[PDB]
Amino acid sequence: SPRIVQSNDLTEAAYSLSRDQKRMLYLFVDQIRKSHDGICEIHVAKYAEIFGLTSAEASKDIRQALKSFAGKEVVFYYESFPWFIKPAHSPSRGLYSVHINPYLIPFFIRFTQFRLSETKEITNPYAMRLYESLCQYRKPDGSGIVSLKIDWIIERYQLPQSYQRMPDFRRRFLQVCVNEINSRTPMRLSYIEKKKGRQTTHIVFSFRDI
DNA sequence: ACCTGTGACAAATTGCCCTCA
DNA sequence: TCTGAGGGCAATTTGTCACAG
DNA sequence: GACGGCCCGG
DNA sequence: GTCCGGGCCG
Ligand SMILES: [Mg+2]
Ligand SMILES: [Mg+2]
Ligand SMILES: [Mg+2]
Ligand SMILES: [Mg+2]
Ligand SMILES: [Mg+2]
Numbered sequence: 496s497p498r499i500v501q502s503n504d505l506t507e508a509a510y511s512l513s514r515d516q517k518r519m520l521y522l523f524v525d526q527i528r529k530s531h532d533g534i535c536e537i538h539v540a541k542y543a544e545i546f547g548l549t550s551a552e553a554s555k556d557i558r559q560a561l562k563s564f565a566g567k568e569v570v571f572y573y574e575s576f577p578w579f580i581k582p583a584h585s586p587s588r589g590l591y592s593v594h595i596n597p598y599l600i601p602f603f604i605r606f607t608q609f610r611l612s613e614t615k616e617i618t619n620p621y622a623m624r625l626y627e628s629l630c631q632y633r634k635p636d637g638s639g640i641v642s643l644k645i646d647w648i649i650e651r652y653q654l655p656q657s658y659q660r661m662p663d664f665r666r667r668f669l670q671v672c673v674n675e676i677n678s679r680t681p682m683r684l685s686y687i688e689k690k691k692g693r694q695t696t697h698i699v700f701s702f703r704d705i
Numbered sequence: 706a707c708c709t710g711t712g713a714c715a716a717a718t719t720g721c722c723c724t725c726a
Numbered sequence: 727t728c729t730g731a732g733g734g735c736a737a738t739t740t741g742t743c744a745c746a747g
Numbered sequence: 748g749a750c751g752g753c754c755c756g757g
Numbered sequence: 758g759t760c761c762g763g764g765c766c767g
Binding site: 662 | 708710
């Protein structure tokens, strides 16, 4: 399946995207990389076959993701850009044409890489973010270990405000996304908490490949 | 005040179904 | 007939906060 | 809608 | 009987 590669600056950027939008974004990065001006395209029926959707639900996902890009911004730590500089539009039935901010090109191409089949069954977008950040530290053989700071996780993945309370962070984000990765990717993930006084400050992730 | 977990409720998202150009 | 653009749904997951200990 | 392949009239 | 361009139907 297609080999996604991306600059670590994108892996570590601060933004808020849905699952459907992240799925589309992987294909944009792939199109761009095979070369330019920044104009990309998406076909409904190919999208449907890639992610095992019907044509109808594919159409619904593309259309609403596309209208949900408006006003979205990307921050590279500290410079913010919009993803799109023109509305999406359809020249032909079943075909969408998109105008990515050409100023984003160099941020796409010290790098992270993974095959698309590794992530295409993940449902929760925060788990996609986590699996990307872990891939950034992976070894040829397939293992790695990394310590991520909680405040940096919250700022980078733009987690919602109630997850500033640690028990909610545990219950609705960490446990769910670790259990997702272990069930939906070829990765096998464990973790332990690092503390300072009563506060938990980092999470230490270890993983190997099956 | 700080920390933890759980019970509830609300809001959002998922894979469905159907209909017609 | 095959595609895809619309219009809906119920079950489930995610986001929030009161309260116990 | 868009596309193909069938069957009408001449 | 056959042959061809085109329209409609699925
Ligand atoms: Mg969908
Ligand atoms: Mg889950
Ligand atoms: Mg303290
Ligand atoms: Mg008791
Ligand atoms: Mg007390």
